Each structure stands twice: as structure tokens, then as C-alpha cells.
Amino acid sequence: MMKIGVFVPIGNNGWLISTHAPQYMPTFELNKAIVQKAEHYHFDFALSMIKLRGFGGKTEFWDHNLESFTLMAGLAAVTSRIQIYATAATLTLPPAIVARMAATIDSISGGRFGVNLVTGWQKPEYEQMGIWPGDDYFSRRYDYLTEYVQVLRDLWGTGKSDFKGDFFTMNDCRVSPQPSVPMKVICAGQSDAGMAFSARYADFNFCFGKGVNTPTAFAPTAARMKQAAEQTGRDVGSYVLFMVIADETDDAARAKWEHYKAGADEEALSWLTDPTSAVNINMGTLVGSYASVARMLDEVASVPGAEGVLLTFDDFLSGIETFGERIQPLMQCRAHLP
Numbered sequence: 001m002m003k004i005g006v007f008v009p010i011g012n013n014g015w016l017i018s019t020h021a022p023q024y025m026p027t028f029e030l031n032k033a034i035v036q037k038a039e040h041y042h043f044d045f046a047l048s049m050i051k052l053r054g055f056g057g058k059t060e061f062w063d064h065n066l067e068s069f070t071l072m073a074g075l076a077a078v079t080s081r082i083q084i085y086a087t088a089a090t091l092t093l094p095p096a097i098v099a100r101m102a103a104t105i106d107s108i109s110g111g112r113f114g115v116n117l118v119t120g121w122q123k124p125e126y127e128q129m130g131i132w133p134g135d136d137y138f139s140r141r142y143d144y145l146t147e148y149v150q151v152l153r154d155l156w157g158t159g160k161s162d163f164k165g166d167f168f169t170m171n172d173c174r175v176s177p178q179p180s181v182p183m184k185v186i187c188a189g190q191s192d193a194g195m196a197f198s199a200r201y202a203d204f205n206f207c208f209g210k211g212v213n214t215p216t217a218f219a220p221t222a223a224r225m226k227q228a229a230e231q232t233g234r235d236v237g238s239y240v241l242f243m244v245i246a247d248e249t250d251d252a253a254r255a256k257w258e259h260y261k262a263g264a265d266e267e268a269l270s271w272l273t274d275p276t277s278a279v280n281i282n283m284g285t286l287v288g289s290y291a292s293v294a295r296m297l298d299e300v301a302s303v304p305g306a307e308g309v310l311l312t313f314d315d316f317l318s319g320i321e322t323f324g325e326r327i328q329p330l331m332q333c334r335a336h337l338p
Ligand SMILES: Cc1cc2nc3c(=O)[nH]c(=O)nc-3n(C[C@H](O)[C@H](O)[C@H](O)COP(=O)(O)O)c2cc1C
Pocket: 048, 049, 050, 051, 087, 089, 118, 119, 120, 121, 122, 188, 189, 190, 191, 192, 193, 194, 195, 206, 207, 208, 241, 310
């Protein structure tokens, strides 16, 4: 059995960098339609990233991005069952503010909220607003994140912090109310330091799916994460990111994938800098008939450590509908749904 989440398009054109891919702005109403349809099909969770600078080109790729906490606060108000995760770019928000924002969305959602904590990697997202700490941050960023999460855990657990470190000084810091349920923390650590952080402080770790139609190719990453979790004695599973391009036949899905690769927005791809393609940032891609994708997702569910998948689509509104109507009913790992 495996959990399914939707990675909501908080940035324009989702995860395809192509003039032949669907062209759309991230609105609230689009993300509302996506999350309500996901909830209707018993998706377990919805997550938004945070992306503070785009890649330009013909498609202005990720030049247009909403902010994650405010988006997910709006989505929490128009849902009732799906788990809601927002991403904190921890260089941009003081931990006491994230603590209070999480208590707030806990109140909006009736205990369905969690936080994805990221260090940030892309210097320009931070340099552009004068808040990059310097190139020491590449090596020290999980030290920073360790202090950050200690402040969050004090505030959510007791309502107060006296934490004092290299990066934070709390003098009887107060945040109440405390969340109604234990606050879920997720991390997207791929490095040794990142997985060591996740093993100590996260409920689950997000990793990248790998290759095109090689669903189990990420297995060594999920194995590293299981070894990290052994070092803390904590149950910290892997949720794996894939793009699904499904149709009625294998040949039809392959034709769509090829059509997207042929439109690659090369100018946007240079800023960024059966194989994976830069057209979806070399994402793990599952391309097939509804039945072929259901079989491949059942193979993901068999990989040691894999507890769920985070899904993008080529078209979210039609991709969620065909997932719910044609793919999910054939998945052995979703036989637990009503
Ligand atoms: C599903 C997923 C979501 C991510 N979201 C973001 C994000 O919103 N913002 C960001 O700066 N980095 C994000 N990242 C980058 C991770 O935090 C990334 O794997 C990490 O920065 C690289 O691993 P390392 O930090 O251990 O080297 C994401 C990664 C994954 C797998």
C-alpha cells in the first residue's frame, strides 16, 4: 500500500519546459480545482514548492510563482480531508514566524497541515534580495537547518523557546496556539547531510524518481535513506517524485512525450544548467497506457523504504481525472481505498 500526493503547480507551466506543453499561469483557482479533484480521488496529500526566481526563455519558465504558505492557507480553507504541505525556504522566514503560520494553517485545515523545510541551493534566488550568507552556506546549510528545526520543535511542543546557537538567539520566544495535532516535518535531503537531517527530524524524506519507465531505478537512494533512519531508530520513509504521462495506449503516451521533447524551450534550459529529458528537469517519468502506468507505480510500491509517490502530470486537470478513473483502480497498492 502506498500514499499518493500531488505536487501543485505554484509555478507557470508546471514541470514542462516546452512550447508544445500546456501553457498556464499558476492561479489560486487553478490550484483549487487541482486539489479539490485530487481530494475527490482520495489523494493523500498536496505539496507546493517555493521558487523565488525563474528560468525565462520563450515560456518564461517559473518566472511566475505564487508563495507557498499563503497558497496552502487558501487551499486548506476549501478542502476537508487531504493533507496540506507548504515549503519554507528557511533563509527567508524567521522560525518563529513559520511556527505561527503552521499553527494558523493547522486551525484553517483542522489538523491537516505540515511543513517541507528546505535549505535553498540556487544562490541567485537569495543573492537577488541580498540575503545569501556566502559560499560557506553550501557546507554549513544543514547546521543552519538543525538550529532552525530545534526552534520550531520547542515552539510547537511547549509554546516557547530559549534556544541559543550560532544562527538563532531565542529569549523566552512564545508562539501559541500550538498545533492541534503533532506537526509533520518533511525534508527533501538527497546528500548524506540532508538524509542525516531527515533521519533526526523529518516524518518523511522526498527524493527524485529516476529515468523514463525505470520505476525502481531510485532504489539505491531509498536504501541510503533507510540506512540514515537506522542511525536514529526513527521510521522515516521515502516519497518519490515522478511525472506521469498516461493515455489509452503506450503509443499515444509516447507520442505526447515526444511532442513535448520536440518543443523544448532551449533558452530556458541553458539558464537551468530512452533517456530522461531536460524538458522536465530530467525528472523520473512514467510514460504509458493507464494500465502500464498502474503496473509501474505498483513496482515503486515494492522498493524498500518507498512509502509514497509525489506526482506531477503533463496536464493536471485531465491527468488527475484519468489517474482517478483509469490508473488508481488497477493499482494493487491502492486496493485499500473504498
Ligand atoms: C520533492 C522535492 C521538492 C523540493 N522543493 C524545493 C523547494 O521548494 N525549494 C528549494 O529551494 N529546494 C527544493 N528541493 C530541493 C531539495 O531541498 C534538494 O533535493 C536539496 O536541496 C538537494 O539535496 P541536498 O540539499 O541534501 O543536497 C526539493 C527537492 C525535492 C526532491
